[PDB]
Every structure is written in C-alpha cells, then in structure tokens.
Amino acid sequence: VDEANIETHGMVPMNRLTDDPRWLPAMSERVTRMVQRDRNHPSVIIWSLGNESGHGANHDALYRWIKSVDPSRPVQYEGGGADTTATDIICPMYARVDEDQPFPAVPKWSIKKWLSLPGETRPLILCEYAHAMGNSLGGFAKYWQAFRQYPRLQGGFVWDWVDQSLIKYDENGNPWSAYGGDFGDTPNDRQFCMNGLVFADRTPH
Amino acid sequence: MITDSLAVVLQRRDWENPGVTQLNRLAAHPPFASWRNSEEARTDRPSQQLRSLNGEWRFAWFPAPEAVPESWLECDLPEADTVVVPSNWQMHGYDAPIYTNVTYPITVNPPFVPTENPTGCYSLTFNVDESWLQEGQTRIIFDGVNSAFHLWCNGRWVGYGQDSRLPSEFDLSAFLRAGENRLAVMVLRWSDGSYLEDQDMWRMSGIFRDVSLLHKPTTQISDFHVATRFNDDFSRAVLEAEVQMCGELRDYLRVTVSLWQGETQVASGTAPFGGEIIDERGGYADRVTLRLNVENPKLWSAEIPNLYRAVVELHTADGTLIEAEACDVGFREVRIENGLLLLNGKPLLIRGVNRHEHHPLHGQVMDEQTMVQDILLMKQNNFNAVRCSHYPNHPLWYTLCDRYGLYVVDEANIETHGMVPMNRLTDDPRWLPAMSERVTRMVQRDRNHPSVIIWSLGNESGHGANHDALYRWIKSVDPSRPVQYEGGGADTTATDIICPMYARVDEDQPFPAVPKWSIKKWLSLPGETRPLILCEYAHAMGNSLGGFAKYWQAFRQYPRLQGGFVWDWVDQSLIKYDENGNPWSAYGGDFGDTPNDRQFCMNGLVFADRTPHPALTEAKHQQQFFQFRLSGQTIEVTSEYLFRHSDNELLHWMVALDGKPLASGEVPLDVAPQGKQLIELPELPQPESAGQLWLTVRVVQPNATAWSEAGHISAWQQWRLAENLSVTLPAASHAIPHLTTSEMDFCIELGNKRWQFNRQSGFLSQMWIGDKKQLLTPLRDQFTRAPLDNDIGVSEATRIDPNAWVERWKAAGHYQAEAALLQCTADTLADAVLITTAHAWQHQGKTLFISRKTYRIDGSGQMAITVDVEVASDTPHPARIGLNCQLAQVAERVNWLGLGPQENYPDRLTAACFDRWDLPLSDMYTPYVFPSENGLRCGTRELNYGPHQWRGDFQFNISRYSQQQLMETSHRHLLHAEEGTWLNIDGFHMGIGGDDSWSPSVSAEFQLSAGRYHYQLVWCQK
C-alpha cells in the first residue's frame, strides 16, 4: 500500500496545514508526484493520501484527483477519524474489537460496532493494531478471531515491523541500542519510537 | 542593490514558469474595508482606513522586460507619460489591442512565452500618513492586473502576482517610510499564466482595476464566513458565521456579530475566540463560530433582494473594538433536489445573459455607472439571472446584484480553447497548482455574497483530471453552491448540473467524443438525473435569436430544464478615430493585430454605447414571467413568479380593428406566485366593416421599481379576434387604361399617370406621375439578401466553408444569376390592361428560378401584381423571394400596418405585434457594426411610403442602402446612402437563425423549400 508523504501530527488543530487552501499546492506534489512514479507497479493495491494529517479540504480534493487520474486503486485515508468521505475504506487506527472509546469529534468504536454504524457500507481495514512495543500483541488473538468472523473486516496492518534504534558506541566501543534522545536531542520521546515486532539487526521479538 | 536590482529579480523569470503563481502575496479574503467604527460598517460609509491609489499614474512602456531600464526603480523616467489608472495601455494606444476567438495571440509553446512581450511600468508616488506607519499592518491591494506584475516599493522588491482577474495583496509595512514613497509596478502582457485563459475577448494587458491601500490592526480578522440554515417551512433560519483572526491571540478579546435589517437589528451574536474542539489534536485557537437564530427572516430572491446587514466586530473585553467588518447578508437556500435545481424551495427557471465586462470607450476597465446601467437593462428586459464569462467580475459588481435583484454565477478564470487537445493544460498534473489558484482564490473572495447561486470551475477548458479534483475541493470547502462545468461535453462528472452550450432543442449534432443532443433528448439519456442549464444559447451576433421562441417554449414545457443564459449581453467593439475624428466601431483586428477573428468577437444582444439590438426586444417578450391564454371573451393570466405576488401590476387590454381600436380595457392584476387570474372583457364591439379584430394585452407597473420607471411594461400579448372577410367589390371605375406599344417599350397611359414596361428587359422600368418619374430603377425579382452573420458563419475568402448558407448560394450562382425573358405579352381588358412577363434565371446553363408575373391595371388605375415563382429542388433554397425597386422620392416617415415597430423575422416574429405603425425613415434601417440585410418587417397588410400605397401581405424593408451595397461594405460607418430609397418587398423570407454562428442554425420549416411560391400585391397611388 503506497502512502503519500504527508503527515501533520504537530499542528493544532492538526487539520490546519491540510485544511488551508494555500497549502494545497505543496500538498498536491506529494500525492500527485507519487501516483505517476508508483502507478505502474503490479503489487500496489491501494493509494493512501495522508497519515495522521487530520481531515482537510485538500484531502477531499486530493482524493478526487487520484480517482480521476487513476481509477484502478481504492483510496484510503486515516485522518478525520477514518470515517472521512475521502477514504474509500474505513481505516480506524488502534481500534478495539471488544470496546470503543470516543474522543469528542473523533469517536472510536469497536470494529464490529463501526461497520454497523448507520449509513455505513465501506469495507474496514485498520491502519494499525496490536502495538508491538516492548511486550505487545496481547489480545492479538481476539483481533484475528474477529477478522475471520466478519466478511466485511479485511484485517489490519500490525505496527510495527522494525523497532527503531540507533547504534551507539561505548568507550569500549561495544554497540548498544539507543532509544529516544540518547544523543540528548530534546525533547526526546525516548523509548516509544522503536515500536518493533522484530529486532533491527534484525532478530524476531 | 541586489537582489532588488532588476537583472537579479527578472531571472530566473517567474512568468515563464507554470508553477509559481505569485511570490509574497497574502491569502485572498472577502473585502472587509477595515473600519474601526462599529456604526460605519453597519452604515457602509466609505472607510477612512481604506485608501485609494487610483488617480493619475506615471507610465513607461517597453517592448521587452529586459529593455526597461534598471535605473527606473530608484526614480521615474523623465520621458514617460502620465496615464490614468486603472487603465488598459492598449486603450491608450501604446500597443494595438489583439483579439482572437480561439487561438492564444502568442505562439503556443507552453509554458514558454514570446521573447519580446510588451511591458508597461507604472510608478506612483504617494504620501502615507504618519499614524499608519506606527501601528498595524498596511497592505497594498490590486483589484485586477494583467497578465502578471512585479512589485517594487521604495526601490525595494515586494511581490510577484500571477493572476490578473483576482485581487492580489502585498504588505508594504516594512517598505513604507515617512513622507512620500515611490511605487514601481511592472506589468507584462504575456505570462506563463496567460496559457490558462484562452477566453475570447479583446485582449488588453495593463492594470484595468483599482489599486488601494488597506490598514489593519495587528490583531484583526483575516477572514470571516457567513452561512445560512433553514427549516423546511423556512420560517426559522439559523445563521452561523466563522471568523479567523490573524497573528496574536488574546483570551480577553471577543468577537460580536450583529445582524441588522433595515434600520433595526434582528439578532446579535457574541463569542470567545476559538470553537468546537475540532478533531483530534486541538480545538482551533484562532477560530470562533457564532450562531444567530432568525425566524420569519426575509429571503433574498431575484424579484426581491430582501437583504440583511451583518457586521463582524472584534473588540476588547471591556471592551474597545480593534476592528470592524461588515458583510451584506441575503437569506437564500440553493440546493439541487431530485435533479431539479431549487432555490428557496422553489424550482428555478433561469433566464440569463452571459456578460463580458467590456467598455468601448474605456476598454476593459468598467465604469461603476456602466454596471448599474447594464444591470438595469437586464432586469428591465425580464432577465433575472446574469452569468459572467469567464472571469470574476469587478468586486463592486457582486454587491450591485445583491441589492438589485438578479442571480449571479461566478466563473473560475480558466479557459483553454487554444490547446490541442484542449484538455491538456487542465489535464496535466503539473499544471494543477496554477489551476488551483483561480478556483481556490475565487471562492474565498466571492463566497460571502448572497447573490451568487453557483460556482463554475472553467469554461471551454475541456475535461481534465484537475477539474475533477478542483470540483471536489469546492464542494468540501463550500457545500452551499452547486458546481457546474461546461467542458468535456458538459456531461462531465465534475458538473453538478449539465450545461450543454449551443445545444439545439429540436435536433442534435454529434462530434466524436463530444456528442451534442437536443436538450429534450439530453435529459432523457440513460442514467442521467441532473438538472440542465445551457451555458449559452440563441447567439445574438448580427441578426440572431431566430428560433428563440422554440428554446423558451421548451423551458416552460419541461420541469427539468432550468433555461440557459443568452450570449451575449454586449457586443464587443473598440472605438476608432477617423482623420475627421468621428468615432466608428471596430470589429476584429481593425488595428491590424493578426490573425484577427474580426467580426465574430462582438456577439452582442445590445449595442456597447449602449443601445438595444432589435433582437433584445424579442428576448424580453419570450422571457416575461406572465403567461396569457385566451378562450373566447375570457383572458387567463398565469404568473411566472415563484416568490412574489403581483402587488403592483396593471393590466391594459385594447381592441382595435385594422390598426384602429374600438375599445380599451384595463384591469388591476392580483396574482400570487404561480397563481392564475381570470379576466373577462366587456363584450367586444362588432365591426360590420371588413378587417381583422386584434386584441392586445400588456402589463405595466403603476409604480416604478428601482430598476424601472413607473409606467414601464413587464409583458404583452396579442391575439387575433375572429377574422372578417369583405365581399365588397372595387369595380367599377369609369376611366379605362389606354396602352401604346413600341417594339422598344410597352407604354400604358391612364389619366395623368403613365406606366412603362420594357420588352427587352421584361420588367417595367418606369412608373409615371405628372410630370414626374416615380422610380429610378426597373422593378425586378430579387432572390437574394445581404448575408446575415449566421449565413456567412466562419466562412472566409481565404478559408471557405461548404456548409455556410452564403457558400451554398455563392456556389449556386444565386447572386450572379441573370434574368432572361422567357416570354412576354401585352393585352387589354375592357376595364383594365393586363401584362404578363415570364423570366428564367439561369446560371451555367442551369435555371435557379422561373418567375411569372402578370400586371393588371384597374379603371381606378390601381395596379395589381401577381407573381409565381418556381425554384428548382436541387438549388439551395432562396434566402428570400421578393421584387426590389429603387424610388427617387424620399419621405420623412414610413407608415405601414403590420408587425411593429421593431424589425422582425419569421424565425423571430414573436416580439412584434400587429398595429398601425409610424416611424422616421432612418429607423427602418438598423445600424450594425457589420452590415447584413436588416430592418425587415413581417405580416404587413399595407405599406405606405410617401405617395405610394402598397396593399397585400408581404415583408418589406425600406432603406437608402442597396442590398448590393450592404453586402459589399466591411463596416457600417462606410456606407453612404444612395439617392432615393431602396424598397424591398418579399412574399416570403428565410429565417434568420441561428443557434450556432459556425454552422447553419436555420430551422427546417423556416426555409422556403416549397419549390412553388405565390404572392400578390397592389401598387396604388396616394
């Protein structure tokens, strides 16, 4: 699944960069440029405009462009709660099968519930599930049990394949993995960055 | 000092590059006017803060951008003349204006442009008040510029602007200094952006729009949005406005919205900054949403503006107000429901004329007065809807519509007629950023206005991926207005409502990949639900609007069809000065700009100056809201109006016989919208005398609306009363005509009068009175008329087209055909003398027509002519069948009984009504920029000029200019009246047409294909 190189986690509201009319030309290049280069490959089955960029007018405009230039591949966008008009298939991220937690303006429901919502027909694939950080994947069976159970649920991508760490050298020169801003870059989110199913080197968690 | 210096700034060049529309340009916002006082915004009094750079402007002109001196930016050149702004430099005559209908004037190598591009640099020196500099931000604003400009302030580079139509704002706060500040602006005729718009209009490059200076407090609201929500009842409407505040944010500061109707406020809204906790990271810091509830709010409509005044004020907590913004608010809901466009819960029938904003005297720049003058005419003429093609209108223009009445359709400033395939510029992914600015920028500026009911992405740009992407953006940013795009055949996915252009109701013509069908057929297409509105119809060029009735008849007939905008409101012409200095209108590249599309450019319903084309009256009659159906004595009136009761309408009916009215009936009119009112006449007087009774009903307004003076007439209808046939006999007269015969000529004498017929000629050369000679030229049959604009079409001597009517006639030898006498004879009735002439018109051994004419002379001496015409089936149908003569006598006034008084044609005789008519002789001729046969009148029982009386049913045009002369002349001004008056009488006349200029638009029924024709008329002295 190809992803347009747009993220705007930082901005508050997050949607502001994507939402603004002026920013559209900068936004366009990443979606537009990406399609031409990667359109040819047989393997790609999907186009994703943005990740965690929120919902903006540009995404709706951009989503329309991808369909018109290319009708071959379904387009999915996570942002806006994943219930956004732009995404062909719902991609709730970190959604819980058993239970749903809602944040005002960004409600999250159990995947079984989410398909069931009034006036919803779209197939649902999770952007992420079963976070692999540290000890992880607990209740992993439950997610998969649900996927087999429901025809509509297409399953979701696990996060994340490789823990992110950078080699560091001791005075001895032995190499120790570094998590977060070991280098002192600040503020450092530290440990959360690695998020890894398998060791970098790589070894299997 | 670099990089301020021209050489560094010029290259890399921006204009050549497709990608950068502008540099250092502030985001577009609806105008606020920046006035601190709360009252002023509600008042709408001109703001003190706003400043106008309009005035005399220093000007310099250079062939190329490289050519213009570097030194100038520091100082204005000594040589350069001072030119008023906003102005078009070409209008000034520095550079000849270039007009091209389809082709870009510059050679097409996107994105590259011709190495030498005419460049004009404007330098303005102004003094800024000290108070402005100390606090706030000051940004220069340009209402319009073309194509692209480079901005220098105080010898320092400021900005680059890529779009002429849109307003561009640059901030001068850093640049400005105490005392006078020089302003240097550079404008280039040709830009990379130029490729985007190929729309066909006279092309002028310069600053055609006002330049002003605006001052904003450091904390001010950059943009505000007004939105309306209504109940199904519409009794209660919820209005919410969102305001975004620039720069610093203070918790204490609050924004208050007040809605004022007339002099009394309806509702007030006040909010703390920020709202709604938008997902997911945070609620907007700088955005506040205010909702105001209005119940029984008046709703804006073309018939009634019904305006509210909304003031947005940002004020301190205590609190003082930092700034005030006022926006006109009209409450209307526009939505497409069930494939039918609906306004305010009522299906909309749109009568609209495409408007190009052009002035012959001032060229592209439009006087404020002109819009008002233009607006009144369209509203006066039964036009409730105006579309501007294909660029955003002057900022003032939208405001006028909202007060005045008529609906406005905004159009994005993108056209790409030139590119082949045309879709290429729009279609390409790279071009999207340039494309985006015109659609995106336009929405923000024009979104606020109540009047606009639609958004149009592009005109004639073809169908491109960008249009589909752009269409999606407009919906998402704004859901209020339906979006329609013409291109791609008008069946494109992007357009909410189909807009076929030049579509024909009766018949459909298809071009591979761009099929066109009759409008009735087009809705019917499989899997089509969209309401259809024509971008253009009833082309008004030259003689035009023929078959206009048919289009309108269809619109009423079908619920889905919403009607279409007429093209075009104003003929486009530029004033030119003779050595005498008299002003003659110029069509095409009179200036020698080439290649020139020439005549086709004007395309005008009404004269530029402006005067109304004979056609315009026809539009008014068809357009009119009221519908009249008559059965017997009873008259039934149906109201077109959706929302308005006829509070002040007066209905007057007059019944007259043979141009004389026995009775006049007037009734007050009280019909609710969609209401039907039945009116019954007092029993009509019955005339024993032979003739036809005529009933005429017209609706006039007792009290003048702002657009219309009192006693103005909205609509009229004419119905024939039961016909009267007279069996009274002319005979008998004691005097008997005596005829004297010579081999050379046939002579008939009765009393004083003498009639001469020439045997060799086969036509009667001379008619005798006194002691006088009546006609200069022998009477002859004429099968040709000066070609109409439609008949000529796109055909030219260089590039002749087989399809065009003129070509078929020319190929035919129809024009050059020479009459021969097949037979001739002279005979004497006891009471009269009868002459029979047979003429065959032969070209190349093939006879186009055979005409037989018999002249019978009464004892009274009144002369009766019966003509029989045979037309070969093979030959292209004769444009008209008539006999034309030249008369020495000249008369001040022409009196005829027939359809009047406007010139009318069989295709468009609907506007005309039958009554006795009197006009100055000059009136009969109709001025045209390009001269074609004109001034024809139809269904005339009797025609009177001077001594002569003509009795019969015929179509007559009487003018000084010969038909041969009319065809010959390039321009209207050139023609010089021939001595005497040319008179044409036609038994039958071909329909003017046409839906399309390019291809013959004439209807099948209108053409005289019968192959057999008979008409008779009487020549009577006195």
Ligand SMILES: [Mg+2]
């Ligand atoms: Mg065009």
